């Protein structure tokens, strides 16, 4: 799977909000482009003159994520974050010259990402009460990954002492994206656990935080809620469910070639962090069949 790389695998089956610190600093921002940020302004002007209803929005930038020594007390993860925008993304990661910017960043800064917007995404492995994961079909008319399978998620917009409010907005945003797109009541959802961070090598290395969320509704009840919104209540064109039993071998199925990179990252992290048992009971051959 060359189109996805794991930047972080969380310990303990995944980290709760109270175990994560953020450092939000202009030191974590994108570097100005070698020939100046005028190249970004030119791309944006061209795009607005074709689609004048488009609007910019601020985004969090991922710089890096450092895990504490395993089994330690105190905070277990430090997220180093900067600020970026939808405009900066379109002028860098989604530029035809994104690979040239990666080579230039390695040369100038020893950092393939130094000249890239790298907005932070969020995604969920969302499990039902009857042990299925939730999948969504992307419209064939959108610019990114048209017609591919996705999981719930989005790119959160900004509004340890500004730190804790930023971690709160990251965890909040994955629940809000489930309520907005799947049409589920907030009180049916567990507090999220962070599973890890995956990079999309087809989008010049932009990263998504991948979370596990449990719903108290069955697959049948989730479907009813999604469909009862009607076609204008969701960006996706359909919903479907795979038993958690069968998610274990999803990379060996024909579904795998239809999954967008960030959904592949969610499923790899679910399998490594929530699946893959370590104890004698769940690891016994009848409960963990070989092959």
Binding-site positions for substrate read 55, 86, 138, 143, 150, 155, 157, 262
Q: How far is the CB of 89 from ligand GV1 (least distance, A)?
A: 5
Q: How far is the CB of 200 from ligand GV1 (least distance, A)?
A: 9
Q: How far is the CB of 88 from ligand GV1 (least distance, A)?
A: 10
Q: Using an 8 Å Cβ cutoff, are 135 and 241 in contact?
A: yes
Q: What are phi and psi of 267, to 5 degrees?
A: -75, -45
Comparison of 119 and 196: residue with beta carbon closer to ligand GV1:
119
Q: How far is the CB of 106 from ligand GV1 (least distance, A)?
A: 22
- Alpha-carbon separation of residue 179 from 77, 212, 224, 226 (angstroms): 27, 15, 14, 10
Q: Residue 143, class by beta-carbon neighbours within 10 Å (0-12 exposed, 13-18 middle, 19+ buried)?
A: exposed
Query: Across the chain, how many H-helices and E-strands are there?
Result: 8, 11
Comparison of 117 and 175: residue with beta carbon closer to ligand GV1:
117
Instruction: Give the helix ranges, DSSP H, for 51-91.
Output: 86-91
Comparison of 28 and 225: residue with beta carbon closer to ligand GV1:
28
Helix axes 219-228, 163-182, angle to 10 degrees: 80
Whole-number Å distance between alpha carbons of 9 and 12: 10
Comparison of 56 and 108: residue with beta carbon closer to ligand GV1:
56
Beta strands in the chain, from DSSP E residues, in sequence order: 4-9, 20-24, 58-67, 77-85, 121-127, 132-137, 149-150, 153-154, 193-200, 206-214, 238-243
For residue 266, give the nearest of 188, 203, 181, 208 by alpha carbon: 208
Known binding positions: 55, 86, 138, 143, 150, 155, 157, 177, 181, 262
Comparison of 193 and 198: residue with beta carbon closer to ligand GV1:
198
Which residues in this chain contact ligand GV1 in the complex, by CB under 6 A?
57, 59, 86, 89, 119, 143-144, 155
Q: How far is the CB of 194 from ligand GV1 (least distance, A)?
A: 19
Comparison of 1 and 144: residue with beta carbon closer to ligand GV1:
144
Comparison of 14 and 123: residue with beta carbon closer to ligand GV1:
123
- Alpha-carbon separation of residue 48 from 85, 87, 188 (angstroms): 15, 10, 40
Whole-number Å distance between alpha carbons of 210 and 174: 9
Q: How large is the C-alpha radius of gyration of the chain?
A: 19
Q: How far is the CB of 91 from ligand GV1 (least distance, A)?
A: 12
Whole-number Å distance between alpha carbons of 38 and 20: 37
Q: How far is the CB of 54 from ligand GV1 (least distance, A)?
A: 9
Q: Which residue is nearest to ligand GV1 (CB)?
A: 155
């Amino acid at each position: 799977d060359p189109e996805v790389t794991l930047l972080l695998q969380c310990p303990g089956g995944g980290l709760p909000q109270e175990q994560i610190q953020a450092e939000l600093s202009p030191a974590h921002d994108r570097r100005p482009l070698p020939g100046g940020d005028e190249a970004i302004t030119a791309i944006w002007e061209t795009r607005l003159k074709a689609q004048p209803w488009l609007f910019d929005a601020p985004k969090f930038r991922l710089h890096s994520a450092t895990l504490a020594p395993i089994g330690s007390r105190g905070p277990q993860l430090l997220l180093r974050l900067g600020l970026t925008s939808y405009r900066d993304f379109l002028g860098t990661n989604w530029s035809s010259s994104a690979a040239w910017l990666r080579q230039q960043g390695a040369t100038d800064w020893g950092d393939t990402q130094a000249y890239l917007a790298d907005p932070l995404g969020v995604g969920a492995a969302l499990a039902t009460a009857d042990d299925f994961l939730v999948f969504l079909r992307r419209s064939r008319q959108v610019a990114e990954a048209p017609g591919l399978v996705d999981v719930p998620g989005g790119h959160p917009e900004p509004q340890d002492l500004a730190g804790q409010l930023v971690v709160h907005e990251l965890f909040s945003s994955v629940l809000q994206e489930i309520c907005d797109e799947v049409n589920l009541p907030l009180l049916t959802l567990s507090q999220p656990l962070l599973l890890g961070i995956a990079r999309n090598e087809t989008s010049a290395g932009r990263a998504s935080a991948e979370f596990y969320v449990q719903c108290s509704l069955t697959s049948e009840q989730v479907r009813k809620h999604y469909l009862s919104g009607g076609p204008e209540a969701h960006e996706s064109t359909g919903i479907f469910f795979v038993e958690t039993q069968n998610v274990r071998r999803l990379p060996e199925t024909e579904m795998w070639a239809e999954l967008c990179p960030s959904a592949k990252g969610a499923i790899i992290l679910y399998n490594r962090v929530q699946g893959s048992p370590t104890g004698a009971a769940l690891g016994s051959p009848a409960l963990l069949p070989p092959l």
